[PDB]
């Protein structure tokens, strides 16, 4: 197989890593295991450490202007690399031993443990004139040659690389999520009744989602127009919750449902980037350097989790909006669902110009 490598500006430091992503196995995330190549001839300060952090760009502007680097550090950890501690001892992994056999004693392994309850690698859709770093949530591996962590790490004395966490659809599709309502009216002897449902629960990006809706409109009033909104419930916990939401898929129908009438129809909606390009602030998945990505995956919240992660939560919900002859009589019905990657197989050979 193949292995990725990154070099420090000074050439003193050559990190080898295997995979730029990690399987969140739900129960676990694949450990960040890699190796470092050091040159003791160039190294004079004899102390080498490598850092993994899950770090978040504090949102866009600071001092009301974009710039600086306000990394709001969700979690940081660093490992003593050279010399390896006489205390810290863990078994070597197959990948890393293969690398050493490629390299020898000059290279030194490291293993990072990713606890659960950690955000998936996501990034907020930058605005059209955002030439700074795309603000968001991602993990970072940085190597350096320093006496101590206190030391002001020289950028020359250091090398960096970014990594992304990913999730994949559970094999068992979820049961159909449905939602039904019955809105009474002061002017209507009998209430309006609404029912909405989806074809399945699990979904893949780029494939259409199909909603059925049934209506009983036996009131004195009509259902004038019906609006279909696939919406992105993105919640953030930078200091507290914030249910900042943006529609992604918007479909309109003038399907008139009169008083004393029935209705039932199927619709299809398809999220994608292009239509929502101009909606600054949308959430997408992992972001490597500058590349085009896909729309944010259906972030999984663990059932056993306490829902207190100071990260980013991405969930997806469809809403049907019935307009009535004219009071806030118009009624919206909400239906959650999952929209996220199919089963994983390989790396992201993202397409771009040479």
């Amino acid at each position, epitope marked *: 197989t193949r292995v990725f490598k990154k070099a420090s500006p000074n050439g003193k430091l050559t990190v080898y890593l295997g995979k730029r992503d990690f399987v969140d196995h739900i129960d676990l995330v694949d450990p960040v295991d890699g190796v470092v190549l050091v040159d003791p001839e160039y190294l004079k300060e004899r102390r080498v450490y490598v850092t993994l952090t899950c770090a978040f760009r504090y949102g866009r502007e600071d001092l009301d202007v974009l710039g600086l680097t306000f990394r709001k550090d969700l979690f940081v950890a660093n490992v003593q690399s050279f010399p390896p501690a006489p205390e810290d001892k863990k078994p070597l992994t197959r990948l890393q031993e293969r690398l050493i056999k490629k390299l020898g004693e000059h290279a030194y392994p490291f293993t990072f443990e990713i606890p659960p309850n950690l955000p998936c690698s996501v990034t907020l859709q930058p605005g059209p004139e955002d030439t700074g770093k795309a603000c968001g949530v991602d993990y970072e591996v940085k190597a350096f040659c320093a006496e101590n962590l206190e030391e002001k790490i020289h950028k020359r004395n250091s090398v960096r690389l970014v990594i992304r966490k990913v999730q994949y659809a559970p094999e068992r599709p979820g049961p159909q999520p449905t939602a039904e309502t019955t809105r009474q009216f002061l002017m209507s002897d009998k209430p309006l009744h609404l029912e909405a449902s989806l074809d399945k629960e699990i979904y893949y990006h780029g494939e*259409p989602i199909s909603v059925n809706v049934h209506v009983t409109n036996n009131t004195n009033k009509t259902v004038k127009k019906i609006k279909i909104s696939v919406r992105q419930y993105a919640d953030i916990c930078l200091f507290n919750t914030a249910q900042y939401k943006c529609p992604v898929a918007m479909e309109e129908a003038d399907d008139t449902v009169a008083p004393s009438s029935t209705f039932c129809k199927v619709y299809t909606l398809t999220p*994608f980037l292009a239509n929502n390009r101009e909606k600054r602030g949308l959430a997408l998945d992992g972001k490597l350097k500058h590349e085009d990505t*896909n729309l944010a995956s259906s972030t999984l919240l663990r059932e056993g989790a306490n829902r207190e992660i100071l990260g980013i939560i991405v969930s997806y919900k469809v809403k049907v909006k019935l307009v009535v002859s004219r009071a806030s009589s118009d009624v919206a019905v909400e239906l959650p669902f999952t929209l996220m990657h199919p089963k994983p197989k390989e790396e992201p050979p993202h397409r*771009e110009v040479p």
Partner: single-chain antibody
Amino acid sequence: GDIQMTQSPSSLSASVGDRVTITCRASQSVSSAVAWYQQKPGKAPKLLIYSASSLYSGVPSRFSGSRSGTDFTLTISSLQPEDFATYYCQQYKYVPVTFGCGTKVEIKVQLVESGGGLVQPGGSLRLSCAASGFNVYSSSIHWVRQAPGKCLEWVASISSYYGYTYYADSVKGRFTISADTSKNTAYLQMNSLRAEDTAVYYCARSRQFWYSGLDYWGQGTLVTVSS
């Protein structure tokens, strides 16, 4: 700039039920963004292997691939009597993705193209690609020309999920691509036509959300230009 995928085993034959090898030489570092296909005399060229390693669904295991540096090898341990074809090597790390000429070896889901024919030089025409069983919003669409007696060349591409259109230099601002997502169709308009345009063009599925090899394509349509 432009990438070349040369082929050493250009002409082989007289080989029955044996292990034979196929070497594609990459004009540049391409990592694993390389795929190999096979094509009969004038049929739909089907996928064989992508990323040089992952053999496709259903394809017999007698087909295998390997990569050494920028050099690429195909093995058939034993040539099954139907395997005789032209086998195409193609890098797909850079736009334009490029196909090299393949290997003649011999012995002594719905997708369809449409809208071709003959056109006078300097004319214009519309080419159609009906697709069925899948979705444009999950699958990229690609038109590729096959000049008879010349290698394959990607010419047109739509990322409907991103709404991006790629073309090659010989069709910059000259041939236009579009896709009726409602009708699940690809349309390509040809302007100011010349001799090079006379070839059989194919439309081909990708798997847009997560790119892989070109799996199932059309039957190809001829576009002829003559004075």
